[PDB]
Structure 1
Amino acid sequence: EDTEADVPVTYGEMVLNGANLVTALVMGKAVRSLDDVGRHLLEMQEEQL
């Protein structure tokens, strides 16, 4: 049917920099999305979901 297909170009991505890097050096346990997992728990602490 078709000979062309749009395929994404950017290949990653994971960034250990930020507050995630502190948990790696200090705690030895590190969640990949902890930059914003700790964010959403604070608004889920507030009003109905």
Structure 2
Amino acid sequence: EDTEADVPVTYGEMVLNGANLVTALVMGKAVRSLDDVGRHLLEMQEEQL
């Protein structure tokens, strides 16, 4: 049906620049995106379902 497709270029970045690096060295574990899990555990908790 077709010969020319559209494909993404960049790869996926997951760099520990942030508060995850603190938990890397002292807590010894690492959330994938603590910058949002740590955020979204404050609007969900008190506002709505």
TM-score, normalised to structure 2, is 0.87
Extract unaligned runs of 5+ from structure 1. Answer: none
Aligned-pair RMSD on alpha carbons?
A: 0.9
Q: How many corresponding residue pairs?
A: 49
**Deviation beyond 6 Å, 4+ runs, structure 1:** none
After superposition, what is the alpha-carbon deviation per residue over 1:1-49, rounded to whole angstroms, capped at 9, x for unaligned? 1111111111112111100110001110111111110101100012223
Q: Identify unmatched segments of 5+ residues in structure 2.
A: none
Report the Cα distance in structure 1 between the residues aligned to 2:22 and 2:44, rounded to whole angstroms: 24
Percent sequence identity is 100
TM-score by length of 1: 0.87
